[PDB]
Amino acid sequence: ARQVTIIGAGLAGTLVARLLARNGWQVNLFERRPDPRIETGARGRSINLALAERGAHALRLAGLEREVLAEAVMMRGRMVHVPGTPPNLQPYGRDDSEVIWSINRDRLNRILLDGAEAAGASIHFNLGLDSVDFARQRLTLSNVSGERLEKRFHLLIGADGCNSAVRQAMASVVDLGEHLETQPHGYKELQITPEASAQFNLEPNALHIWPHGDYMCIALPNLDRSFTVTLFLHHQSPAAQPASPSFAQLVDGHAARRFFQRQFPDLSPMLDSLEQDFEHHPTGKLATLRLTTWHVGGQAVLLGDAAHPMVPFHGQGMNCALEDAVALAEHLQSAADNASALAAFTAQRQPDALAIQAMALENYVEMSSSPTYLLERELGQIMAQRQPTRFIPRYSMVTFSRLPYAQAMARGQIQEQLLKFAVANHSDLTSINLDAVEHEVTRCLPPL
Ligand SMILES: Cc1cc2nc3c(=O)[nH]c(=O)nc-3n(C[C@H](O)[C@H](O)[C@H](O)COP(=O)(O)OP(=O)(O)OC[C@H]3O[C@@H](n4cnc5c(N)ncnc54)[C@H](O)[C@@H]3O)c2cc1C
Numbered sequence: 001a002r003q004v005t006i007i008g009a010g011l012a013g014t015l016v017a018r019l020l021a022r023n024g025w026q027v028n029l030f031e032r033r034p035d036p037r038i039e040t041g042a043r044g045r046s047i048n049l050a051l052a053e054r055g056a057h058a059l060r061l062a063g064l065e066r067e068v069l070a071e072a073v074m075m076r077g078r079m080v081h082v083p084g085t086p087p088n089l090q091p092y093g094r095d096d097s098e099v100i101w102s103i104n105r106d107r108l109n110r111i112l113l114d115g116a117e118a119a120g121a122s123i124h125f126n127l128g129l130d131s132v133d134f135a136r137q138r139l140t141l142s143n144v145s146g147e148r149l150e151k152r153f154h155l156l157i158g159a160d161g162c163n164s165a166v167r168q169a170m171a172s173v174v175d176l177g178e179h180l181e182t183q184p185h186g187y188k189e190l191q192i193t194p195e196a197s198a199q200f201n202l203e204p205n206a207l208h209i210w211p212h213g214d215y216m217c218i219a220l221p222n223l224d225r226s227f228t229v230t231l232f233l234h235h236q237s238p239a240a241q242p243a244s245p246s247f248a249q250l251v252d253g254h255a256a257r258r259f260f261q262r263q264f265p266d267l268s269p270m271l272d273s274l275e276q277d278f279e280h281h282p283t284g285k286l287a288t289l290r291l292t293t294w295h296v297g298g299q300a301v302l303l304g305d306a307a308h309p310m311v312p313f314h315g316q317g318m319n320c321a322l323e324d325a326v327a328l329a330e331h332l333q334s335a336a337d338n339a340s341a342l343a344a345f346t347a348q349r350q351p352d353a354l355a356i357q358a359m360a361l362e363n364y365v366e367m368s369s370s371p372t373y374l375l376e377r378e379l380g381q382i383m384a385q386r387q388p389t390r391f392i393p394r395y396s397m398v399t400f401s402r403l404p405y406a407q408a409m410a411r412g413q414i415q416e417q418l419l420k421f422a423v424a425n426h427s428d429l430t431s432i433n434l435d436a437v438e439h440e441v442t443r444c445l446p447p448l
């Protein structure tokens with residue numbers, strides 16, 4: 001049986017552990033954190049993720065989708081909150097088959113850990129990867145106290161997240177050609193209780209957005225009607241705009257409350273623990289990191305956040321990481337040797353990771369912001385009605401299909417260009433020749 005060592009019992013690492021172990025690989029998975037399945041008396045907090053078709057299909061192939069969905073809240077559409085107007089529900093898709101699912105991260109990781117173990121993988125917690133000796137094929141792990149443990153390895157999978165230790169170790173034996181693009185927004189998680197969401201009639205089956213230009217809030221629902229709110233706000237005010245809101249200006253919870261009361265007046269009343277959440281929850285960091293190289297011969301490979309940290313605005317990080325896990329297990333299982341598998345996996349996935357990284361950056365403006373854009377959207381709806389297999393909104397291609405991200409981006413660009421051109425020099429839809437636009441759709445967009 002082929003042997004593999006996986007670092008990181010997160011989303012991609014646990015999925016790939018299950019896929020390989022059920023194919024008879026000898027799998028050992030090392031995780032820095034304790035096993036979350038071991039109940040303690042610690043007070044934990046709910047972070048929610050939006051599971052979409054790419055992630056759901058990966059779970060489906062693994063035989064875990066039913067279990068995960070049983071614990072997920074359907075989000076039918078985007079509920080946009082702008083003071084003055086009642087919340088506007090913009091359905092994500094054609095019907096309830098085209099929805100996204102809000103899942104609690106802890107519940108998902110419990111299911112995935114159980115799944116990896118049921119397939120035969122051995123999971124070792126409280127062991128953080130410290131270093132790798134590629135030449136000697138040994139690695140060093142340690143617990144939080146720094147007590148070291150050395151292990152031999154044959155194949156090393158870096159599923160160890162955005163601050164990957166495997167990536168740092170590889171960066172010493174190969175030039176990874178890393179390009180880090182910092183993102184100016186930090187984030188803070190805040191809570192809405194089940195009583196508060198019910199009192200303020202907050203729709204449970206939707207993803208909520210409070211757009212505010214350079215900053216915004218979103219909220220994702222839980223099974224118990226609580227919501228996790230995420231505030232996206234610049235860490236610092238830029239030199240050009242010194243008065244502009246930023247985390248630096250919010251010196252404490254009381255400052256955060258005043259900011260919410262002024263800028264998010266319909267949200268502030270739902271945030272009962274705003275002060276406490278602001279002071280006790282750490283401000284998160286966002287970034288895009290692109291690597292030229294994801295593997296070292298047949299010895300080691302990166303996937304998920306370890307390979308391609310991306311900004312969160314498309315809700316695709318987990319979806320992409322689970323899609324990577326399936327691809328890596330497929331390549332490893334069927335290749336002539338590990339070196340061939342890792343090279344083929346990297347070649348296949350790299351263009352798609354670049355595409356989703358670019359599309360995720362572009363989705364911020366779609367969420368946080370129109371005049372001409374409404375006419376484009378109106379024309380886009382007609383094109384999608386006349387040619388549903390050709391004109392598929394980019395959001396639908398990324399979220400509800402398994403089309404390679406690079407292809408979703410390329411088709412989205414053709415669609416965006418056609419709409420922009422077709423609406424230019426037009427006041428309304430009555431002056432636009434719908435058949436000429438449709439002819440360009442059938443000419444430029446092959447049916448899917
Ligand atoms: C709050 C939040 C909400 C998000 N919401 C969404 C969403 O709505 N939709 C979406 O698709 N994506 C979302 N994402 C992104 C998504 O969570 C990540 O893209 C995804 O978890 C990446 O999976 P991974 O397996 O590559 O990394 P992770 O799931 O982060 O797993 C990495 C694992 O490696 C472990 N580890 C780290 N360093 C070491 C080490 N040295 N040794 C051993 N173990 C180590 C970590 O403890 C962890 O268990 C969200 C991210 C955050 C932070």
Ligand SMILES: C[C@@H](Oc1cc2onc(CCC(=O)O)c2cc1Cl)c1ccccn1
Pocket residue numbers: 048049050078187207218220230284312313314315316363366367
């Ligand atoms: C909750 C998650 O943020 C998002 C999840 C998401 O799912 N789907 C979307 C797109 C929704 C749309 O266009 O209508 C989306 C956006 C974000 Cl910011 C998050 C929090 C903090 C750190 C990283 N990730």
